[PDB]
Design an enzyme around this catalytic site. Structure first.
Site, short mmCIF file in Angstrom:
data_model
loop_
_atom_site.label_atom_id
_atom_site.label_comp_id
_atom_site.label_asym_id
_atom_site.label_seq_id
_atom_site.Cartn_x
_atom_site.Cartn_y
_atom_site.Cartn_z
CB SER A 1 -0.87 -0.03 1.18
OG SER A 1 -1.62 1.13 1.25
NE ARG A 2 2.69 2.91 -5.70
CZ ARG A 2 2.54 2.72 -6.93
NH1 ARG A 2 1.45 2.31 -7.55
NH2 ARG A 2 3.50 2.24 -8.03
#
Lengths: 101, 117, 118, 284, 85, 86, 117
Positions: free
Chosen positions: F33-34
């Site tokens: 997840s960024r």
């Protein structure tokens, strides 16, 4: 002259034909001249003196073992490390300690 | 700019030393799966030890990434990072656990982390 | 066609082709210049015909014969590629030359275990 | 899958195959050195058995706990194993043969007892739960008798203390360079090896200090000698087993290279055809 | 003579050839991409003294001339099976 | 490759995990997840950080130490935590 | 339709057990290919022995294949097959040979075939 072999379980220390030797037996010093009597005894740790045939005198350290003699053929069954019932009992306890682990 | 002249021999030989170790590690790494470390040799065991700890010492926590990590960002000066890599290159401080080299930043903090664990 | 003349005089003739792979590739390049749709691994669509047009003239007739010795290059070391696969349909014998046998000093450096003939 | 990674697999397996060929060559050479060390172990035991034969089978025969015969109420095994893998089934076949006989005696109600040489047998019998009282491990390719003294002293101690009644060593036999077999042989009580002579009359030994103490030391040294001989034969059997295993590994690696290259070349050709179809069908 | 990237000449020739609508071949290079590098490199030669004397109308007689060439190519991932390499 | 380029993260579902009983078959190592922990409640934030990194590195140790058929004490402790969280 | 609610837990759990074992056998084939089976772990050898027995017990004689096999065909009820696979996975049949499971309708027929070797 006689055929002598000095041997251990791992390797054969020495061999050949010999004029005489001096050895520290369990009870005392012994000299093997040509054609000596049959003998069996334990031998003590230390140097033993070889005189090979044609007179080449030499020292061999042995950590102990057994001597046997008979007139034509003689041999020493040497131990590698100092052997003691107490020391071996200590090794026996050491061996058990590993088993627990 | 990784030219001996400008960066000086100090930096260039340190860098080429790191590069040569990490390539040797990559060659061993495949056959290590077949051999473990059991059938590897003693020459290999020092090199892999240096390589893994060098490859940990290349990590760093970033002031940006504190969001991801909780640990504060670190800054490390050029002279210090040369001193640290050459320190494992020559000083070979294998006294210290492998995680002591990881995400610490400076050489002093790397030993202090090992002093703490 | 020069070998066909010596055959028609009644001789038995040898034709050496210095690389049969370069005939195949010349036919690909010309076919691409003419704009025909490619085939197989990008070869010309006429690949098997153009090989057949060459190789079927090299035969023993009732007047004489042409025997041929053709150097072969195998692309990517791949014996499944259409150029090798098309050429090997026409070869009768196959002589392999070895660097190792030359290293022994044995000349000619033919390999007896990979050379074959049908 | 993907020809660039398939080509990476091919290079990795090729590198693996070269190293296994190297290990085959080394294992053959180490087998030779360990079978020279094997022959040197014979003369000591052979002459010690002649002396024991002279006393035991001469008229001056005695009674001794290791020479006397009794019914089995507990049993012991010395067991030799490698410290290193890649030996194939050498350990497992030996341990299976041991498990059958150890089952057979314990069904007679006999508690079995174990001493382990090498760490493979230690780990296996700890997983099995066999009754292990002593071990030595990490002798590697340089066994020594003075390391063996511990575990045999324990088993000897239990034998004359009457806690053991028969003692085996369990070991492979280096019958040939090409073939070896797992064996279980009884070292105590002394086997009745015939060793028949009358030439003892003609040279008969002066017993200093006394006969019986000398005979006990001979019996103890003889047992140590047989255990060391078994260990050195099992080490030479290991090197010959690793040699044939690495041969089979090198051939199975090469046979896998020839299959991966067919997969790679087929993917190479298909990728060219598909890309050139998209180009030609892409114009106009 | 050193040609610093014959790979970049093939790519430039591919560009200009596609913009002229010429039919593409493998890796979209035009059909005559071999003839591009072939006629370039076969100019690198040693020429005997009779060629030099004939060319220069006898102003030079004993010498043999030459042009040696070191072309450079760049491979991708060490793949030598690409068209241009 | 386009939709991987556009999005803020990736959950990768693998059939080798789904077939070995690991359902839901999210691969920890390749999924990211960024935004990460900035979209968690803070309790979950503490616990999450340890779990992801331990799993991905456990995967390396498990491959390494199985074919090696080998043991070391901290590695053993690490490995049978990594299997228990997995 | 392979859901605990639709087929019940025992069926679902037996099917996931069969998949889990057979997948784990696929994970072992690369090391078995390079090094052979003697370098496997002592319960990895047990997985491989159960997986091969499961592979063979999936095979079945068909009434339309008598023209090919010549063997008489078999019909196996659901209750009977899940009991067989569950019993192999629990290891109550771990003393039969592989060949006993080939082309048999029900587990009974496997123990009967093992009596005929």
């Amino acid at each position: 002259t006689y055929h002598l072999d000095v041997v251990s379980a791992e390797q054969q220390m020495f061999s050949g034909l010999v004029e005489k030797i001096q050895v520290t037996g369990s009870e005392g010093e012994l000299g093997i001249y040509p054609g000596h009597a049959p003998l069996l005894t334990a031998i003590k740790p230390g140097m033993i003196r070889i005189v090979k045939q044609h007179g080449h005198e030499e020292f061999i350290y042995l950590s102990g073992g057994i001597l046997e003699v008979q007139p034509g053929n003689v041999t020493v069954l040497a131990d590698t490390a100092i052997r003691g019932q107490d020391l071996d009992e200590a090794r026996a306890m050491e061996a058990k300690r590993k088993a627990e682990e | 700019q990784l030219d001996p002249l400008v960066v000086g021999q100090e930096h260039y030989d340190t860098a080429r030393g790191v590069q040569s170790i990490l390539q040797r590690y990559q060659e061993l790494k495949d056959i290590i799966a077949i051999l473990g470390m059991d059938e590897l040799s003693e020459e290999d065991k020092l090199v892999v030890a240096r390589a893994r700890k060098i490859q940990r010492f290349l990590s760093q926590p970033f002031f940006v990434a504190e969001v991801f990590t909780g640990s504060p960002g670190k800054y490390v000066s050029l002279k210090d990072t040369i001193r640290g890599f050459k320190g494992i290159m020559e000083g070979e401080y294998d006294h210290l656990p492998e995680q002591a080299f990881y995400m610490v930043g400076s050489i002093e903090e790397a030993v202090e982390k090992a002093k703490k664990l | 066609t020069m070998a066909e003349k010596f055959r028609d005089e009644g001789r038995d003739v040898l034709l050496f082709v210095d690389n049969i792979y370069r005939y195949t590739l010349a036919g690909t390049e010309v076919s691409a210049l003419l704009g025909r749709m490619p085939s197989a691994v990008g070869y010309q669509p006429t690949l098997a015909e153009e090989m057949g047009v060459l190789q079927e003239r090299i035969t023993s007739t009732k007047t004489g014969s042409i025997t041929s010795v053709q150097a072969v290059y195998v692309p990517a070391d791949d014996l499944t590629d259409p150029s090798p696969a098309t050429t090997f349909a026409h070869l009768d014998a196959t002589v392999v030359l070895s660097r190792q046998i030359a290293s022994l000093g044995i000349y000619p450096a033919v390999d007896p275990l990979d050379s074959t003939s049908r | 899958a993907g020809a660039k990674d398939i080509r990476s697999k091919i290079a990795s397996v090729q590198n693996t195959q070269k190293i296994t060929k190297a290990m085959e060559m080394v294992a053959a050479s180490k087998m030779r050195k360990s079978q020279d060390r094997m022959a040197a172990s014979r003369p000591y035991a052979e002459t010690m058995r002649k002396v024991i034969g002279h006393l035991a089978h001469g008229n001056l025969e005695y009674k001794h706990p290791y020479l006397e015969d009794r019914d089995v109420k507990r049993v012991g095994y010395l067991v030799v194993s490698t410290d290193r893998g890649l030996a194939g089934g050498l350990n497992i076949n030996l341990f299976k043969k041991l498990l059958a006989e150890m089952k057979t005696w314990t069904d007679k109600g006999v508690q079995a007892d174990l001493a382990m040489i090498g760490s493979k047998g230690v780990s296996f019998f700890n997983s099995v739960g066999g009754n292990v009282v002593a071990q030595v491990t990490g002798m590697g390719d340089n066994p020594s008798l003075s390391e063996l003294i511990g575990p045999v002293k324990v088993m000897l101690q239990a034998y004359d203390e009457g806690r053991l009644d028969k003692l085996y060593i369990v070991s492979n036999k280096f019958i040939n360079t090409m073939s070896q077999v797992p064996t279980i042989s009884q070292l105590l009580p002394l086997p009745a090896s015939d060793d028949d002579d009358l030439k003892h009359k003609s040279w008969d030994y002066l017993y200093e200090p006394d006969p019986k103490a000398l005979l006990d030391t001979l019996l103890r040294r003889y047992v140590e000698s047989q255990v060391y001989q078994g260990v050195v034969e099992n080490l030479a059997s290991e090197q010959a087993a690793r040699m044939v295993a690495m041969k089979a590994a090198t051939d199975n690696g090469g046979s896998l290279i020839k299959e991966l290259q067919l997969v790679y070349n087929k993917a190479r050709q298909a990728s060219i055809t598909q890309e050139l179809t998209e180009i030609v069908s892409g114009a106009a | 003579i050193i040609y610093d990237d014959l790979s970049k000449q093939a790519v430039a020739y591919r560009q200009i050839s596609l913009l002229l609508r010429r039919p593409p071949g493998r890796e979209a290079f035009p059909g005559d991409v071999f003839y591009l590098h072939s006629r370039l490199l076969e100019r690198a030669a040693r020429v005997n003294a009779e060629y030099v004397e004939a060319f220069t109308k006898g102003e030079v007689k004993g010498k043999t001339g030459s042009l040696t060439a070191l072309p450079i190519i760049e491979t991708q991932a060490g793949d030598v099976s690409a068209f241009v390499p | 490759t386009n939709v991987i380029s556009i999005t803020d993260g990736q959950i990768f579902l693998e059939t080798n995990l789904f077939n070995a009983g690991i359902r839901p078959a999210v691969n920890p190592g390749i999924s990211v997840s960024r935004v990460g922990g900035a979209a968690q409640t803070k309790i979950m934030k503490k616990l999450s950080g340890g779990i992801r990194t331990a799993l991905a590195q456990y995967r390396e140790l498990a491959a390494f130490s199985q074919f090696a058929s080998d043991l070391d004490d901290a590695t053993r402790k690490q490995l049978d935590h990594g299997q228990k969280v997995t």
